[PDB]
Design a protein around this ligand. Sequence first.
Ligand SMILES: *[C@@H]1O[C@H](CO)[C@@H](O)[C@H](O)[C@H]1NC(C)=O
Ligand SMILES: *[C@@H]1O[C@H](CO)[C@@H](O)[C@H](O)[C@H]1NC(C)=O
Ligand SMILES: *[C@@H]1O[C@H](CO)[C@@H](O)[C@H](O)[C@H]1NC(C)=O
Ligand SMILES: [Cl-]
Lengths: 264, 98
Amino acid sequence: SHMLKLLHFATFQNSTSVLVGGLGLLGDVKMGSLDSRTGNIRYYRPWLRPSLPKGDWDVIESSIKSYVRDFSRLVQMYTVPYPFVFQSSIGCELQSNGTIRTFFDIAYEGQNFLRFNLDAGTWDQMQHNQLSAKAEHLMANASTLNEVIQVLLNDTCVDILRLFIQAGKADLERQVPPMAVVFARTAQLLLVCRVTSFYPRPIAVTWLRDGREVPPSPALSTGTVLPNADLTYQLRSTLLVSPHGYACRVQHCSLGRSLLVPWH
Amino acid sequence: DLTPKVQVYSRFPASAGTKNVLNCFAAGFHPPKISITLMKDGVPMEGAQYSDMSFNDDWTFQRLVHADFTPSSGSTYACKVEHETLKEPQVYKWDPEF
Ligand SMILES: *[C@@H]1O[C@H](CO)[C@@H](O)[C@H](O)[C@H]1NC(C)=O
Ligand SMILES: *[C@@H]1O[C@H](CO)[C@@H](O)[C@H](O)[C@H]1NC(C)=O
Ligand SMILES: *[C@@H]1O[C@H](CO)[C@@H](O)[C@H](O)[C@H]1NC(C)=O
Ligand SMILES: [Cl-]
């Protein structure tokens, strides 16, 4: 599975002022972003620019900048009091299947507000209120744009995806092994397994009691995955125990075989 | 709106006099405007770098702030966060075990 995702957001501060940002992602690899001051696209990965000719880049940049500009203009024209925020998430995903999933969602005040329907080439209203109803009817009226959106999502996004999978294969296939320590915190005792340095993000950290997986309960917290700045990840998992043998088990694709760290 | 959820943690298990990176990650917040400042002994840390603002599949914004550091015994480290959901700036101390 691979995914190409473009993210955009906009805070409308008043009728003439809007702070925009945007990001391009290939899985969790940041391809580039939108300079929130000049609006010029910045490219973060060296394989990007040579993967397409200049003319294609020019069309991509101009379409991004028109999208952003037209978005702000539509909102100001048709809205509801300042300040508020819109977001977009636009892209496609390729399974190993060969199966394509496309997405084009707009959020408003942090909730799904409009969603593109690829097969019908129209818009689904996502909020049960007048603003979302208006937006849906307005966008339903743009037949030609919607025909073009269908091709952008189903053909051009996918084609660029396939090509980016090949051009950026080094990023995508990069792996970094986890490092893990176990220590106890005063509590009962709270055992902590802290894992860092791993890439890619999927991982399985479990506790063993005498070689046996401790089942889920409120005694066992597995935390949430946290990012490091060098595009690796960190996790902490804990187990409330009473002073059995305990070890933390870390399974990760960089390992094929798992990391086993005993509590001492 | 949604108040930020903040974690402060180092890149590696910390050790006095050993080079490391201090991370402050704010997440789950809305609107995106927020100040995040890594602090050492009550003052902003030098060398702080700010990730691009981004948001997760459920639309909540997040940001990672990080700085190279060499923790020493006796210094204290924190991340200070201002967001409109907060009546005042909130100081999250680094627990040198995390
Ligand atoms: C809109 O916002 C900006 C910056 O906050 C300000 O400089 C500008 O004059 C504002 N416009 C109005 C009509 O208040
Ligand atoms: C999307 O693309 C594939 C061809 O690559 C096609 O079989 C499928 O029907 C397309 N769906 C739409 C709505 O165009
Ligand atoms: C869509 O177009 C119709 C007829 O062309 C028009 O009367 C209507 O107001 C439009 N709907 C919106 C929301 O603009
Ligand atoms: Cl780092």
